[PDB]
Design a protein that fits this description.
Two copies of one chain form a homodimer. The first copy, chain A, has helices spanning about 20-30, 30-45, 65-85, 100-110, 170-195, 215-235, 240-245, 255-265, 290-300, 305-310, 315-330; strands at about 50-55, 90-95, 120-125, 140-145, 195-205, 270-280, 340-350. With about 350 residues, the first copy, chain A, is an alpha/beta fold. Chain A has a single domain (about 20-350), classed as Rossmann fold, CATH 3.40.50. Chain A is globular and about 70 Å long. The first copy, chain A, starts with 20 loop residues before the first helix and ends with a strand. In chain A, about 45% of the residues are buried. The interface of A and B includes residues 102, 103, 118 and 137 of A. The structure holds S-adenosyl-L-homocysteine (2 copies) and 1,3,7-trimethyl-9H-purine-2,6,8-trione (EXU) (2 copies). The site of one 1,3,7-trimethyl-9H-purine-2,6,8-trione (EXU) has 9 residues of chain B, from helix 9. One S-adenosyl-L-homocysteine binds near residues 2, 94, 118 and 142 of chain B. It is classed as transferase. Keywords: N-methyltransferase, CkTcS, transferase. It forms a dimeric assembly.
């Protein structure tokens, strides 16, 4: 399951790295959260000797992951100047599933090194649902749009005819995802529990929703639209529907209260600061519906192609996303509901 | 060179991972050297608490780097029980362009991480390493040795390494460079290894103490002729074979010592040499056993050579290589001398 989850490898031509415009803005909207978090590590005083270990979980191949490395070093070098002490060292651990194209990210990481603080970038392949780093190895943890991806799909059963929680899917389809996120998030939080230094800090950003029920269009339109495009191909006979009935995507966008309660029960890290914000799903600067759709199709296909192609096949991929782009521009007039995101800042209690 | 050096990236059939034939034997001989060093770290006692950091500097995409990790972890498993809750952190280090995807594809308490970059510079935080390993990686320079230019034409015309048909300065030139680059490796590593930490490094060198001995440099010699013959055919430019010199050096046992002596940070617990057959030689067909030697040569020299002559004429080059090895020498070459060197931070 984690053996086939990742984003478009390479390159970048219509891959993940080229189509990372939206997610870069989420980091931009949550950059101060990191900046404050770095300052707290300096207020801790204990982390000033001798080296500070930070890590980004779920870095893909895209240009977003060294954005935060830049802010961490910049902020660190700034407070390094106030302390008037050139001893600060920084080791950064970039984490993603094995299937990820590290060479593309490495080639990207190769350019930005090459200065008060030295920076050491290491790559850590593997799932973050288990333990990745030795005990008390991390002062700071950062994660953007990677937490919501589940360990496994929630569990002749059926979620007809969708790949996700919808208005057309009652009722354990909503409940399973809820308990499943609790299942996966707990592993994550608990695996971190032994990984982060006491009084450490944590900054998590994931895609969620403000609605009480996730079947609302704003919450689940990506999967609802994907579910339509695959279903229409079944009408054409290109794909068998019983595969669509069976396939549901291992991912989940939760509400803030659900997310809080998830962190509360496991009293490892107290919630320093939580917040929910909605960005315009796509820009929206183009008056051409095809332009808005294509830019949004290529970015949606970018982070969904490998996980979907596993179930439906490499070959038919091109036709599905073309049908998906079409119903966005023509059927939906290049207009989509807002996209909620959740800034989640924690600090280990032990 | 740091940008354009990597082993053959991929997974078959010319990839270095499929061509680990020779190196897996060297790792076997240095396994006891590795076995002991891992145990001396336990003798250092302080390393019991709390987690031990190991680093392989030069792991390619081949499976040989897992061979080193497996024994660190397995040896520790026995040491902990007698001592009665441990953790190991292994860093895989290599240049960029290294098929870490292939590396990590072959990959899948012990937590391993990938560290891209040269070991001629800083790679790890200060006082963070207890044990460091590097097999057949250190003898690569960061550049063609200085002093092969210009004077103002020149100089190793027409070969790619130290040979008989060459001015006396090339022996000094290659020894000059290696000294400089190795110091930086020792200099950089001097500030990462914990005090009384351990460092086990493996490279190949000469036993003849003369750089131009056929035994010591047959690989580059057999290549140099292989390139040269294809030059006569007009297939490859002539000036290129002359100007280009390979960024690698095979030091003597005594020459290694000085380098380590000059830089007082590391002391020598042990240092030895062992010569292995360049090929087996357990096979009867020369034309079908020299190819395996030809394949593994192509596994680590294709990218560094394709860079200067283009990948366009590569296939014909190693075709002559195999021909030279299997016809001229009748599939018989001098043994490859390998060097085990065990060090400790003098702090
Ligand atoms: N269980 C898991 N363990 C480790 N990484 C995971 C994971 N589930 C999803 N991911 C990774 O999380 C990534 C989200 S895309 C990365 C988001 C952001 N643009 C950035 O560059 O940081 C994907 O590459 C995916 O491989
Ligand atoms: N100067 C250097 N710094 C880091 N790795 C190097 C190096 N020179 C060679 N290597 C690596 O060591 C490995 C030897 S196998 C090769 O894959 C090569 O990429
Ligand atoms: C659910 N979700 C998105 O919606 C999204 C992602 N990156 C984008 O740019 N978008 C829009 N990823 C990574 C994802 O997980
Ligand atoms: C110079 N040189 C070799 O000659 C060699 C290597 N691997 C082997 O199997 N051989 C023989 N490597 C890694 C190397 O750099």
């Amino acid at each position: 399951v984690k053996e086939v989850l990742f984003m478009n490898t390479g390159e970048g031509e219509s891959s993940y790295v080229q189509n990372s415009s939206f997610t870069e803005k989420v980091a931009s909207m949550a950059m101060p959260a990191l900046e404050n978090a770095v300052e707290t590590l300096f207020s801790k005083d204990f982390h000033l000797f001798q080296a500070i270990n930070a890590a980004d979980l779920g870095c893909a191949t895209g240009p977003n992951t060294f954005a935060v490395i830049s802010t961490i070093k910049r902020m660190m070098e700034k407070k390094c100047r106030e302390l008037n002490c050139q001893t600060l060292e920084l080791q950064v651990y970039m984490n993603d599933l094995f299937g990820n194209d590290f060479n593309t990210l490495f080639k990207g990481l190769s350019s930005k090194v090459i200065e008060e603080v030295s920076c050491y970038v290491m790559g850590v392949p593997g799932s973050f649902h288990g333990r990745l780093f030795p005990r008390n190895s991390l002062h700071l943890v950062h994660s953007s749009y990677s937490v919501h991806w589940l360990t496994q799909a929630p569990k002749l059963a059926l979620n007809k005819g969708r790949i996700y929680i919808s208005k057309t899917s009652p009722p354990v389809v909503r409940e399973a995802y809820l308990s499943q996120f609790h299942e996966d998030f707990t592993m994550f939080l608990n695996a971190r529990s032994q990984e982060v230094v006491p009084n450490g800090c944590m900054v998590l950003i994931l895609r969620g929703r403000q609605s009480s029920d996730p079947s609302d269009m704003q919450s689940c339109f990506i999967w609802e639209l994907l579910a339509i495009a695959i279903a229409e191909l079944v009408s054409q006979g290109l794909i068998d529907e019983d595969k669509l009935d069976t396939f549901n995507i291992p991912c989940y966008f939760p509400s803030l209260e659900e997310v809080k309660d998830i962190v509360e029960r496991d009293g490892s890290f107290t919630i320093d600061h939580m917040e929910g914000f909605e960005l315009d799903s796509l820009q929206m600067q183009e008056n051409d519906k095809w332009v808005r759709g294509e830019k949004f199709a290529k970015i949606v296909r970018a982070f969904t192609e490998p996980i979907i192609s596993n179930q439906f096949g490499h070959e038919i991929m091109d036709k599905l996303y073309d049908k998906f782009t079409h119903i966005v521009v023509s059927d939906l007039e290049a207009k989509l509901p807002k996209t909620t995101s959740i800034i989640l800042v924690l600090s280990k209690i032990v």
